[PDB]
């Protein structure tokens, strides 16, 4: 299976540099061109850079010609996008893509790059258990408050991905430059009574991961 996995995103200040990586597998790497395409909510999908199969030809979008440089290392089945002189507007989700002569056949997961003078803020993670009442339900919903982080994104898993269904991570609100979100998981009351339920919050930009166990209040 064709796989493309990016890394190297995060926050940087205007004027600084950042290098993105895309690790390829599941096809003959040297047989195909690679490319980078970025996306903002405002300006949709935007091609920024392409490198030919043999690495000897490179092409750039207008807004980045001169500042960005794309390269590949066939031995590592990897390609890179060195970004220099970054500006507010370069803030975006960056996708790697493989070509097939006349289109992008496969796409990465995307990595978020934020160009801002604002500082990285790791979230506080708070456990959300229901308040006590008279009656207990069959099912119970437990939460994980992920408060005041910058920049996006965060990821939340529950018991390291063991709890998969009944999981909702709710998109964040933005207030005074900080994001807050919640992730919920719905489990049988019997599971919570017997086993531990733990939210796992990752924040790439601050290089933080936090596990928090939900206990009855």
């Amino acid at each position: 299976e064709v796989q493309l996995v990016e890394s190297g995103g995060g926050l940087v200040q205007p004027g600084r540099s950042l290098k993105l990586s895309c690790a390829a597998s599941g096809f003959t790497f040297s047989n195909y061109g690679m490319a980078w395409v970025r996306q903002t909510p405002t300006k949709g999908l935007e091609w920024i850079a392409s490198i030919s199969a043999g690495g000897d030809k490179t092409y750039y979008g207008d807004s980045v010609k001169g500042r960005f440089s794309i390269s590949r290392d066939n031995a590592k089945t990897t390609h890179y996008l060195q970004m220099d002189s970054l500006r507010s507007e370069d803030t975006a989700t960056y996708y790697c893509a493989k070509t097939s002569r006349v289109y992008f056949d496969y796409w990465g997961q995307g990595v978020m790059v934020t160009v801002s003078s604002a500082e990285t803020t790791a979230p506080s993670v708070y456990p959300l258990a229901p308040g006590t009442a008279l009656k207990s339900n069959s099912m119970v919903t437990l939460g994980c408050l992920v408060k005041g982080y910058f920049p996006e994104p965060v990821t939340v898993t529950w018991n390291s991905g063991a709890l998969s269904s009944g999981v909702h991570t709710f998109p964040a609100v933005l207030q005074s430059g900080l994001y807050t979100l919640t992730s919920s998981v719905t489990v049988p009351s019997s599971t919570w009574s017997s086993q531990a339920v733990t939210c796992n919050v990752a924040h790439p930009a601050s290089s933080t991961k936090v596990d928090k166990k939900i206990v009855p209040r």
Binding site: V102, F104, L128, G131, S184
Partner: protein, 214 residues
């Protein structure tokens, strides 16, 4: 050397057939290939149509591509439209550069109606330690996607420190969330707070209280 123009938004009924257009501004649409990518919320693009009208393996035959020379437009036709067709659709072409259309978000109307489930959560003790209290209101499992979220304190409207996220699709349904930022003292000073969601004229609510069982 050209732009591709897509309507920012199109709506269609569940089960209907819909056409999404993509018009080249200058030069012939037939001069270079047009491709079509579907992107769901917070996910990567996947290729739906390549080389004008060819479909990858795994892509349902409900998707077809075509080129209309007289409108200088490419068309992506989706038949027997489904819930999961709600997504952004981008057309793509090239010549000396590589061009994407602005993208068309597809709304699918007439899905099974569904009242929101409310989950409310009081402030955690850990948060309260630091003299702050965020009240949480999770809104899930609703359709359509339009809701009105309002907070009460002792049953009276409150707007200060409210933050609501616009509904987004996650599964086959819509979710939203609202937060009420308080200090500990503001939290303790009340008998009840209420999260109130209004959906297609019907109101649903759940309340929280600092008041302790004993």
């Amino acid at each position: 050397q050209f732009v591709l123009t897509q309507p920012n938004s199109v709506s269609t009924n569940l089960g209907s057939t819909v056409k999404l257009s993509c018009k080249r501004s200058t030069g012939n649409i037939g001069s270079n290939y047009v491709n079509w990518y579907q992107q769901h919320e917070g996910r990567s693009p996947t290729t739906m149509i390549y080389r004008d009208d060819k479909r990858p393996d795994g892509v349902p035959d409900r998707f077809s591509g075509s080129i209309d020379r007289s409108s200088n437009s490419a068309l992506l036709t989706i038949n027997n439209v489904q819930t999961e067709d709600e997504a952004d659709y981008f057309c793509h072409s090239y010549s000396s550069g590589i061009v994407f259309g602005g993208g068309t978000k597809l709304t699918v109307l007439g899905q099974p109606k569904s009242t929101p489930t409310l989950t409310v959560f009081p402030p955690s003790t850990e948060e309260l330690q630091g003299n702050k209290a965020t009240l949480v209101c999770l809104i899930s499992d609703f359709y359509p996607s339009d809701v009105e979220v309002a907070w009460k304190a002792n049953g009276a409207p409150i707007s200060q420190g409210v933050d609501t996220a616009n509904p987004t699709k996650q599964g086959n349904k819509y979710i939203a969330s609202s937060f009420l930022r308080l200090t500990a003292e503001q939290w303790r000073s009340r008998n009840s707070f209420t999260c109130q969601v209004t959906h297609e004229g019907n109101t649903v609510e759940k309340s929280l209280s600092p008041a302790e069982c004993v």
